Amino acid sequence: ENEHAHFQKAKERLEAKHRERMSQVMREWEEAERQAKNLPKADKKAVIQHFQEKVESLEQEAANERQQLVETHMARVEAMLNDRRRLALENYITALQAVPPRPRHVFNMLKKYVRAEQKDRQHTLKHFEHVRMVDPKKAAQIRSQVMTHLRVIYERMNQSLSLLYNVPAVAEEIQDEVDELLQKE
Amino acid sequence: FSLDDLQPWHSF
Ligand SMILES: O=C(O)[C@@H]1O[C@@H](O[C@H]2[C@H](O)[C@@H](NS(=O)(=O)O)[C@@H](O)O[C@@H]2COS(=O)(=O)O)[C@H](OS(=O)(=O)O)[C@@H](O)[C@@H]1O
Ligand SMILES: [Mg+2]
Ligand SMILES: [Zn+2]
Ligand SMILES: [Zn+2]
Ligand SMILES: [Zn+2]
Ligand SMILES: [Zn+2]
Ligand SMILES: [Zn+2]
Ligand SMILES: [Zn+2]
């Protein structure tokens, strides 16, 4: 339901709100520092302390909102992508069992299944690329789970396309259309 | 879990 694009608007909102809250605190700190000139040293020290804690507290609030936004989006996108792929695969397997065989209908059901696998692959690569850009240490930690995910997608898609060559009549008829679809994937 | 979970050659 364009779930990744809803995550980008939410990500942008979060960021503008953080920038707004931060500039507000910097403004308040200027007013306070100015006012603390006429006060004793203990008040000058406390203003510095209250404002350092306020900026640190804001940094932590933003970090927590980011983390929770990424987690909620990853879980939502994975459930959605799994459901589309479960359905597109079930259809493709149903199309393969038609008597007499229906090659054009098998290809139509395969295209939708390959693309569903492709979206899962693409979105996994998009999320890992983000982590690599923003947090190399977290990326190095998740790299093996990501590559494992990519291995599952790739292997399952190959086990699936193999079923097509298992019905030689259908395969010989659509071998040109499948390879013209695979090279562009 | 898997192509296996769908039970393609027998039930569902
Ligand atoms: O050479 C042919 O394929 C030709 O056209 C067939 O039409 C097929 C459609 O192309 C399919 N959909 S598509 O989106 O246009 O690709 C599909 O609706 O069904 C048709 C056959 O494929 S399958 O058997 O369903 O797999 C004609 O099909 S017909 O037999 O239904 O009339 C075919 O006769 C004609 O040679
Ligand atoms: Mg991401
Ligand atoms: Zn995403
Ligand atoms: Zn204060
Ligand atoms: Zn910040
Ligand atoms: Zn991020
Ligand atoms: Zn997946
Ligand atoms: Zn992750």
UniProtKB/Swiss-Prot annotation, chain A:
Modification type Phosphoserine: residues: 57
Tissue: Expressed in the brain and in cerebrospinal fluid (at protein level). Expressed in all fetal tissues examined with highest levels in brain, kidney, heart and spleen. Weak expression in liver. In adult brain, highest expression found in the frontal lobe of the cortex and in the anterior perisylvian cortex-opercular gyri. Moderate expression in the cerebellar cortex, the posterior perisylvian cortex-opercular gyri and the temporal associated cortex. Weak expression found in the striate, extra-striate and motor cortices. Expressed in cerebrospinal fluid, and plasma.
Compartment(s) where it occurs, according to its Swiss-Prot or TrEMBL record: Cell membrane; Membrane; Perikaryon; Cell projection, Growth cone
Post-translational modification comment from the UniProt entry: Proteolytically processed under normal cellular conditions. Cleavage either by alpha-secretase, beta-secretase or theta-secretase leads to generation and extracellular release of soluble APP peptides, S-APP-alpha and S-APP-beta, and the retention of corresponding membrane-anchored C-terminal fragments, C80, C83 and C99. Subsequent processing of C80 and C83 by gamma-secretase yields P3 peptides. This is the major secretory pathway and is non-amyloidogenic. Proteolytically cleaved by caspases during neuronal apoptosis.
Disease annotated for this entry: Alzheimer disease 1: A form of Alzheimer disease, a neurodegenerative disorder characterized by progressive dementia, loss of cognitive abilities, and deposition of fibrillar amyloid proteins as intraneuronal neurofibrillary tangles, extracellular amyloid plaques and vascular amyloid deposits. The major constituents of these plaques are neurotoxic amyloid-beta protein 40 and amyloid-beta protein 42, that are produced by the proteolysis of the transmembrane APP protein. Cerebral amyloid angiopathy, APP-related: A hereditary localized amyloidosis due to amyloid-beta A4 peptide(s) deposition in the cerebral vessels. The principal clinical characteristics are recurrent cerebral and cerebellar hemorrhages, recurrent strokes, cerebral ischemia, cerebral infarction, and progressive mental deterioration. Patients develop cerebral hemorrhage because of the severe cerebral amyloid angiopathy. Parenchymal amyloid deposits are rare and largely in the form of pre-amyloid lesions or diffuse plaque-like structures.
Domain notes: The transmembrane helix undergoes a conformation change and unravels partially when bound to PSEN1, facilitating cleavage by PSEN1. The basolateral sorting signal (BaSS) is required for sorting of membrane proteins to the basolateral surface of epithelial cells.
Name of this protein: Amyloid-beta precursor protein
Whole-protein residues included: 385 to 569 of 770
